[PDB]
Design an enzyme around this catalytic site. Structure first.
Site, PDB file in Angstrom:
ATOM      1  CG  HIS A 113       0.167  10.536   6.510  1.00 47.37           C
ATOM      2  ND1 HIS A 113      -0.804   9.857   5.842  1.00 47.37           N
ATOM      3  CD2 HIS A 113      -0.102  11.853   6.291  1.00 47.37           C
ATOM      4  CE1 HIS A 113      -1.634  10.673   5.254  1.00 47.37           C
ATOM      5  NE2 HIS A 113      -1.266  11.937   5.512  1.00 47.37           N
TER       6      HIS A 113
ATOM      7  CD  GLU B 116      -4.150   9.567   2.171  1.00 49.07           C
ATOM      8  OE1 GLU B 116      -3.898   9.567   3.394  1.00 49.07           O
ATOM      9  OE2 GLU B 116      -4.622   8.545   1.616  1.00 49.07           O
TER      10      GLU B 116
ATOM     11  CB  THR C  57      -6.146   8.207   5.130  1.00 47.21           C
ATOM     12  OG1 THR C  57      -4.825   7.707   4.935  1.00 47.21           O
ATOM     13  CG2 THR C  57      -6.090   9.492   5.906  1.00 47.21           C
ATOM     14  CB  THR C  58      -5.243   2.712   4.619  1.00 47.98           C
ATOM     15  OG1 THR C  58      -4.550   2.251   5.800  1.00 47.98           O
ATOM     16  CG2 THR C  58      -4.267   3.675   3.965  1.00 47.98           C
TER      17      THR C  58
ATOM     18  CG  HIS D  87      -0.785   8.595   1.441  1.00 53.29           C
ATOM     19  ND1 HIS D  87      -1.497   7.404   1.421  1.00 53.29           N
ATOM     20  CD2 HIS D  87      -0.558   8.820   2.751  1.00 53.29           C
ATOM     21  CE1 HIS D  87      -1.696   7.007   2.677  1.00 53.29           C
ATOM     22  NE2 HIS D  87      -1.121   7.862   3.518  1.00 53.29           N
TER      23      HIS D  87
ATOM     24  CG  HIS E   6       2.705   6.025   5.614  1.00 49.16           C
ATOM     25  ND1 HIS E   6       2.405   5.970   6.959  1.00 49.16           N
ATOM     26  CD2 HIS E   6       1.616   6.542   5.014  1.00 49.16           C
ATOM     27  CE1 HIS E   6       1.169   6.424   7.172  1.00 49.16           C
ATOM     28  NE2 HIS E   6       0.695   6.768   5.991  1.00 49.16           N
TER      29      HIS E   6
ATOM     30  CG  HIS F 116      -1.743  -1.238   1.340  1.00 48.78           C
ATOM     31  ND1 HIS F 116      -2.667  -1.603   0.372  1.00 48.78           N
ATOM     32  CD2 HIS F 116      -1.751  -2.210   2.270  1.00 48.78           C
ATOM     33  CE1 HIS F 116      -3.223  -2.744   0.726  1.00 48.78           C
ATOM     34  NE2 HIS F 116      -2.671  -3.148   1.869  1.00 48.78           N
TER      35      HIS F 116
HETATM   36  N1  LIG Z   1      -2.530   7.012   6.473  1.00 48.51           N
HETATM   37  S1  LIG Z   1      -2.600   7.025   7.971  1.00 48.51           S
HETATM   38  O1  LIG Z   1      -3.881   7.565   8.414  1.00 48.51           O
HETATM   39  O2  LIG Z   1      -1.396   7.609   8.544  1.00 48.51           O
HETATM   40  C1  LIG Z   1      -2.596   5.344   8.523  1.00 48.51           C
HETATM   41  N2  LIG Z   1      -3.405   4.420   8.199  1.00 48.51           N
HETATM   42  C2  LIG Z   1      -3.160   3.240   8.833  1.00 48.51           C
HETATM   43  C3  LIG Z   1      -3.883   2.063   8.685  1.00 48.51           C
HETATM   44  C4  LIG Z   1      -3.425   0.981   9.439  1.00 48.51           C
HETATM   45  C5  LIG Z   1      -2.325   1.051  10.296  1.00 48.51           C
HETATM   46  O3  LIG Z   1      -1.940  -0.082  11.011  1.00 48.51           O
HETATM   47  C6  LIG Z   1      -1.602   2.244  10.453  1.00 48.51           C
HETATM   48  C7  LIG Z   1      -2.071   3.313   9.683  1.00 48.51           C
HETATM   49  S2  LIG Z   1      -1.303   4.882   9.711  1.00 48.51           S
HETATM   50 ZN   LIG Z   2      -0.964   7.820   5.567  1.00 48.95          ZN
END
Ligand SMILES: NS(=O)(=O)c1nc2ccc(O)cc2s1
Ligand SMILES: [Zn+2]
Ligand SMILES: NS(=O)(=O)c1nc2ccc(O)cc2s1
Length: 256
Positions: free
Chosen positions: A116, A103, A195-196, A93, A91, A61
């Site tokens: 993020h 996002e 957001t995932t 996006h 990470h 992802h």
């Molecule tokens: N994009 S975000 O809102 O920073 C994320 N989403 C997830 C989903 C699962 C998870 O285990 C960790 C995260 S961090």
């Molecule tokens: Zn994220």
């Protein structure tokens, strides 16, 4: 089996993650004119001097740079936050083209990418407990625009060749995430979600106003990653962003 393709992307997630249509979903559009300065916000404190990075992982992802969170080595405090939030990973996006990839949006503007930095509230003891709480997580979001190279990003870029496909990881010690921040810590904040999937409504979002610049060559290397596993047909990891969700009964506050 959720993803970002036509058959498993954000329009489909609600069927297995019904909270996708919840009351505090992320990301959102930040309407700069409707956001209000909040003089109640305390100064934000990004305290990353003892950060211990360990590994970088392609999870199918995105890619995560993972930290040792067994101690308060890298924490976020202040701003809208009550207590101490420990850095666990960061990470990004990004898009297929420079005109999309973030996002959050700012007055409907999409940036090329969004970083993020994910933190959990230490009063809940671990990440898994933290995501059962409405104030379990704090995510520091930083926009990326394309222009001058970001020197502090280049070590990330150069290891991506070694984690091209889903499930691959590499050692990634001694990386300093302070090199990914802009000069200014002026932000917007609102309550939202991951957001995932699982899209849990457990996040205090802190989105910096000032973007960082990265080079075209740097983001082009992001776009050479794969969503697929080794030996499988190539699907470039691009456009791994969720679009903006309804703001509902929320207010976005400004620190400036
Ligand atoms: N994009 S975000 O809102 O920073 C994320 N989403 C997830 C989903 C699962 C998870 O285990 C960790 C995260 S961090
Ligand atoms: Zn994220
Ligand atoms: N709701 S979700 O988690 O986005 C999805 N799951 C599947 C599983 C198989 C499949 O063929 C398509 C999807 S979309």
């Amino acid at each position: 089996h959720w993803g970002y393709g036509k058959h498993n992307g954000p329009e489909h997630w609600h069927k297995d993650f019904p909270i996708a249509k919840g009351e505090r979903q992320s990301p959102v559009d930040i309407d700069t004119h409707t956001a209000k300065y909040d003089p109640s916000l305390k100064p934000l404190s990004v305290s990353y001097d003892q950060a211990t990075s360990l590994r970088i992982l392609n999870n199918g992802h995105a890619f995560n740079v993972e930290f040792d969170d067994s101690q308060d080595k890298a924490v976020l405090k202040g701003g809208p936050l009550d207590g101490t939030y420990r850095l666990i990973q960061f990470h990004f996006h990004w898009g297929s083209l420079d005109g999309q990839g973030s996002e959050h949006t700012v007055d409907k503007k999409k940036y090329a990418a969004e970083l993020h930095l994910v933190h959990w509230n230490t009063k809940y003891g671990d990440f898994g407990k933290a995501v059962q709480q409405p104030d379990g997580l704090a995510v520091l979001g930083i926009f990326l625009k394309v222009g001058s190279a970001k020197p502090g990003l280049q070590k990330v870029v150069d290891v991506l060749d070694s984690i091209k496909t889903k499930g691959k990881s590499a050692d990634f010690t001694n990386f300093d995430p302070r090199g990914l921040l802009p000069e200014s810590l002026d932000y917007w904040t609102y309550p939202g979600s991951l957001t995932t999937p699982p899209l849990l409504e457990c996040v205090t979002w802190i989105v910096l106003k000032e973007p960082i610049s990265v080079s075209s060559e740097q983001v082009l290397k992001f776009r050479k990653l794969n969503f697929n596993g080794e030996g499988e047909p190539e699907e470039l990891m691009v456009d791994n962003w969720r679009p903006a969700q309804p703001l509902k009964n929320r207010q976005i506050k400004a620190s400036f």
